[PDB]
């Protein structure tokens, strides 16, 4: 049986602050610029609709130069860092970005039709844009976050399923890697292997997996390592109502309509889809620039950062403003000409993560050792890397630690609270 | 006279948690896919506008392997499970879906007409869509939920009523079966037997009954078995204003207008109808992912789950995102062509129901036996199935029970509250 980590871990009055100086990432908002024929990316895709997961690294307290280690006995106990407070700072001004597809699959605006739709003549794709769903969610944990998405499974029939038949829906768990895309109102799904048209969805997520944090699974996890604190403030609506083009995969049952004549004799496509909207973004609705205290983590893991690791997932579409960036080819021309200017899109993202840690000690009794081993043997192996598979924003705080909370803003806020 | 169940049922400190692992249902959002000529459904209709009523089954405490039954005397009393806490977990990301009719009956946009409407020339139906009313309602009870809807009654006249005359309005009670459709802003009515056009309403509810929970009847029920706790957070508005086509069933009185001339001489149809809208969906407006404590059920039935049954009705249009699913007939073509891709719509629904139960004991005095018999003799017959008529999501928790609340998230939340 799992036990509240507190039941055996003791807390101390030795507090420390550590936070990045100024994280900054700049890149194209839609797709990763690269070279004409390489997989050498030249400018990364930096969009506000990405899970900026920071794999923070903490110094090992057992090998840390404390001023005097009389507070704990190394001969019988070890040390770990417990996350008491987190502040996800944000510097860039609030503003919702934009994305679109030059050839989004959109037959007609079925929102309000004055006359019946005309014939769907070969490739009626359109240059359409939209402002994506608003999302603000912060996750703090020690195990990597686990999201979700709809992938491809085994089809209903096993007849070497017919070309273009139903792609079966499967619910697939996966670790949310840094740079992955948040659900944008089109549903959490792997468009890459689930939508061939390559036109159902805007460009910036067309060939990426829209993952969503599996809050149920993470909360029901036995040890609750994935997250012990979180928030979510996502919202949107149907800005517009559109229709998909293409041959009907599932024809409307004939008991589900009376046959038409003439122009209406052609049943128009019923494959409707919505266009999301990142509605009001305001300071009052701001998750960030606030200190969250994890003193009462739901999880059995009450903030203990096993392995000197912290996973801080941050989603912020309330600062996803994509700003243009035109550069003049030549100023020798006295009159404006459209082709004289090259168009560039670059989204600026700024992060400044801050933390407060309370030192803890673990007494190595036989029962405590057995429990910790069963929980995660890799923890014992550290005192007495499986994450290479996933890409994270590698953030090192091993030298950023300081014992003077009063000097830093988060430390002062924690002092005033504590 | 009915008596508060507490007046004779005693509570115990023996608590238990039990909840599904991960419920999941996937299917077409509009209509049930089937075979070309059968009533063999191939893919069920899974839409976010459906009453997902779960008929939970609980283990019988009288035949349950408790660690030691010294707490109660089987020779004179029995046991029942009382529902103390419920958490309707939701995993899928929030997002409002969409539905529409290829031939919705819509003459013209009477919202703002620049010129008088033209002639209504045979089958002016249109391909129109809409985003349905937003609804979030959870009902917890022991008897099955009872909704309402407008059906067909006996007409005003009994002359073998003339073809196409008034279909009389009748208010009809009925048990809300799993898969039934919630009111979507078009009113609670049985379109199947009340709208012959088959075009007044979008496809996904065109041939289904729009039921609404009869809160008044359920609350005024003598024993209050149908529900002892509920919530409702539904809202919408008129996105657009439209007009119906067809011959006028009820001609406008002549004292109710001055006759026109020329183009306006033709009185346009006055059969106006609104197009609903599922306005802002947000985390702040979330019923779910929260624990509701039924300690103060209004009902005389204070959560007692007679018959080891629980009926959990869940409506969630704030996660009704319909996601497409294009499949490729053949990649042999280098250029896009509309007919090369088949269109599919599949809506993913994920549920994770959790509960806390407090064990109770019933002392079999003569008066108590008589009262319970009069209330529901079937209860006594269990100690010393009429629901086969209705389809429910049969959810079995008989083996999911556990006495360790601390291990599960709802159990921990209940511990912190209690």
């Amino acid at each position: 049986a799992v036990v509240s980590t507190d039941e055996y871990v003791a807390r101390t009055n030795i507090y420390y602050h550590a936070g990045t100086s100024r994280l900054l990432a700049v890149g194209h908002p839609y797709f990763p610029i690269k070279k004409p024929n390489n997989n050498k990316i030249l400018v990364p895709k930096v969009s506000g609709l990405q899970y900026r997961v920071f794999r923070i690294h903490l110094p090992d307290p057992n090998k840390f130069g404390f001023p005097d280690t009389s507070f704990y006995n190394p001969d019988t106990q070890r040390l770990v860092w417990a996350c008491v407070g987190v502040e996800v700072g944000r510097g860039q001004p609030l503003g919702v970005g934009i994305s679109g597809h030059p050839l989004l699959n959109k037959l007609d605006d079925t929102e309000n039709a004055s006359a019946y739709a005309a014939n769907a003549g070969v490739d009626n794709r359109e240059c359409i844009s939209m402002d994506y769903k608003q999302t603000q969610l912060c996750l703090i944990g020690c195990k990597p976050p686990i999201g979700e998405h709809w992938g491809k499974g085994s089809p209903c029939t096993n007849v070497a399923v017919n070309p273009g038949d139903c792609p079966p829906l499967e619910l697939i768990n996966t670790v949310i890697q840094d740079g992955d895309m948040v659900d944008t109102g089109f549903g959490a799904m792997d468009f890459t292997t689930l939508q061939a048209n390559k036109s159902e969805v805007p460009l910036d997520i067309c060939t990426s997996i829209c993952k969503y944090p599996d809050y149920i699974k993470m909360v029901s996890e036995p040890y609750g390592d994935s997250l012990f604190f979180y928030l979510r403030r996502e919202q949107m609506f149907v800005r517009h109502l559109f229709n998909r083009a293409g041959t009907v995969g599932e024809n409307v049952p004939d008991d589900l309509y009376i046959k038409g004549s003439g122009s209406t004799a052609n049943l128009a496509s019923s494959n409707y889809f919505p266009t999301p909207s990142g509605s009001m973004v305001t300071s009052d609705a701001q998750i960030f620039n606030k200190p969250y205290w994890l003193q009462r983590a739901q999880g059995h893991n009450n903030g203990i950062c096993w392995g000197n690791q912290l996973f801080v997932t941050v989603v912020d579409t309330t600062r996803s403003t994509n700003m243009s960036l035109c550069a003049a080819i030549s100023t020798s021309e006295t009159t404006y000409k459209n082709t004289n200017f090259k168009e560039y899109l670059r989204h600026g993202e700024e992060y400044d993560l801050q933390f407060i840690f309370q030192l803890c000690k673990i007494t190595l009794t036989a029962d405590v050792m057995t429990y910790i081993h069963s929980m995660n043997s890799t923890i014992l192996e550290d005192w007495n890397d499986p994450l290479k598979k996933y890409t994270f924003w590698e953030v090192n705080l091993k030298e950023k630690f300081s014992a003077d909370l009063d000097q830093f803003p988060l430390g002062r806020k924690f002092l005033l609270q504590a | 006279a009915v008596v508060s169940t507490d007046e004779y049922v005693a509570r115990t400190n023996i608590y238990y948690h039990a909840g599904t692992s991960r419920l999941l249902a996937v299917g077409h959002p509009y209509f049930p896919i089937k075979k070309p000529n059968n009533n063999k459904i191939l893919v069920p209709k899974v839409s976010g506008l459906q009453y997902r009523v779960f008929r939970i089954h609980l283990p019988d405490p009288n035949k349950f392997g408790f660690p030691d039954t010294s707490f109660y005397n089987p020779d004179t009393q029995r046991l029942v499970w009382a529902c103390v806490g419920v958490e309707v977990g939701r995993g899928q990301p929030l997002g409002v879906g969409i539905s529409g009719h290829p031939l919705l009956n819509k003459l013209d946009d009477t919202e703002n007409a620049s010129a008088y409407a033209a002639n209504a020339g045979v089958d002016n139906r249109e391909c129109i869509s809409m985003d349905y009313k937003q609804t979030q309602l959870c009902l917890i009870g022991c008897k099955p939920p009872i909704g309402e809807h407008w059906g067909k009654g006996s007409p005003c006249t009994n002359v073998a009523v003339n073809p196409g005359d008034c279909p009389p309005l009748e208010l009809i009670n009925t048990v809300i079966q799993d898969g039934d459709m919630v009111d979507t802003g078009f009113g609670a009515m049985d379109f199947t037997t009340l709208q012959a056009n088959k075009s007044e309403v979008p496809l996904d509810i065109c041939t289904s009954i729009c039921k609404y929970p009869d809160y008044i009847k359920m609350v005024s029920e003598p024993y209050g078995d149908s529900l002892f706790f509920y919530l409702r957070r539904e809202q919408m508005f008129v996105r657009h204003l439209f007009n119906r086509a067809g011959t006028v069933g009820e001609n406008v009185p002549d004292d109710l207008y001055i006759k026109g001339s020329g183009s306006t001489a033709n009185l346009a149809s006055s059969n106006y109808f609104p197009t609903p809208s599922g306005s802002m969906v947000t985390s702040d407006a979330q019923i779910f992912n929260k624990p509701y404590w039924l300690q103060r059920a209004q009902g005389h039935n204070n959560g007692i789950c007679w018959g080891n049954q629980l009926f959990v009705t869940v409506v969630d249009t704030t996660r009704s995102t319909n996601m497409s699913l294009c499949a490729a007939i053949s990649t042999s073509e280098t250029t896009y062509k509309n007919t090369n891709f088949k269109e599919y719509l599949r809506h993913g629904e994920e549920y994770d129901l959790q509960f806390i139960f407090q064990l109770c004991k019933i002392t079999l005095t003569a008066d108590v036996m008589t009262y319970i018999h009069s209330m529901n003799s079937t209860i006594l017959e269990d100690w010393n199935d009429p629901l086969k008529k209705y389809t429910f999501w049969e959810v079995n928790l008989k083996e999911k029970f556990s006495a360790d609340l601390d291990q599960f998230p709802l159990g921990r939340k209940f511990l912190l509250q209690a």
Partner: antibody
């Protein structure tokens, strides 16, 4: 490859019973999603679908000839049996058993066709 | 037949000829796929088009089709001697409850 070879009486007389029989190879009738149809073509006339059978034993027939038609399949022989009752002289036509793939849309199709066998009623 | 086709069309080598199959709201209007079959007389039919303007395996890349209104088309560009065959459109019908074929256009390659 999927191969179909028809067999039956090339000559029949009126008011008799006709039993065609199409053999399938390279494919199993037990596999889910497999279907096979029969399509007859009178001399110099357009094709006319007759019946469809699938893995789920679900059967379809042309409405005009529904009262005369019954189809089945034998897993042991990997076989499809078609029976037409009360043969008329005008039924003379070539009969093709074609592997129907049963796509999601009710516009099914016949991916592969057999050699075809002439049936003459006189 | 519920579906309709021109009884005969002709085209000299190197020309493009379209065989149009027109249905009704019951079969092609509902959205049921249109399939074209090339049949050399006296032999078994062959699958030529699998969905509107879709090419099966082993079919020459010059053959195609289209979907337009309640009708479909079979465009054979760059005609050749091999195109001396009949063609049948095929779909599903809602009044018949069964699968139907067209009138069997008899394409001929002119001298």
């Amino acid at each position: 490859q999927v191969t179909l070879r028809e067999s039956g009486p090339a000559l029949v007389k009126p008011t008799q019973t006709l039993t065609l029989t199409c053999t399938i190879s390279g494919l199993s009738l037990t596999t889910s999603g497999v279907c096979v149809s029969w399509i007859r073509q009178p001399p110099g006339k357009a094709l006319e679908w007759l019946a469809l059978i699938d893995w789920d034993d679900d059967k379809y027939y042309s409405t005009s000839l529904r009262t005369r038609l019954t189809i089945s399949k034998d897993i042991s022989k990997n076989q499809v049996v078609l029976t037409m009752t009360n043969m008329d002289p005008v039924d003379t036509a070539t009969f093709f058993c074609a592997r129907t793939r049963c796509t999601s849309n009710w516009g099914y199709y016949f991916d592969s066709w057999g050699r075809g066998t002439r049936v003459t009623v006189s | 037949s519920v579906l309709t086709q021109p009884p005969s069309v002709s085209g000299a080598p190197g020309q493009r000829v379209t065989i149009s199959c027109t249905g009704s709201a019951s079969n092609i209007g509902a959205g049921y796929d249109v399939h074209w079959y090339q049949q050399v007389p006296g032999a078994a039919p062959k699958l030529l088009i699998f969905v509107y303007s879709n090419r099966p395996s082993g079919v020459p890349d010059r053959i195609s089709g289209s979907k337009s209104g309640t009708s479909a088309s079979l465009a054979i560009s760059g005609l050749q001697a091999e195109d001396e065959a009949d063609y049948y459109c095929q779909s599903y019908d809602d009044s018949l409850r069964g699968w139907v074929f067209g009138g069997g256009t008899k394409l001929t390659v002119l001298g």
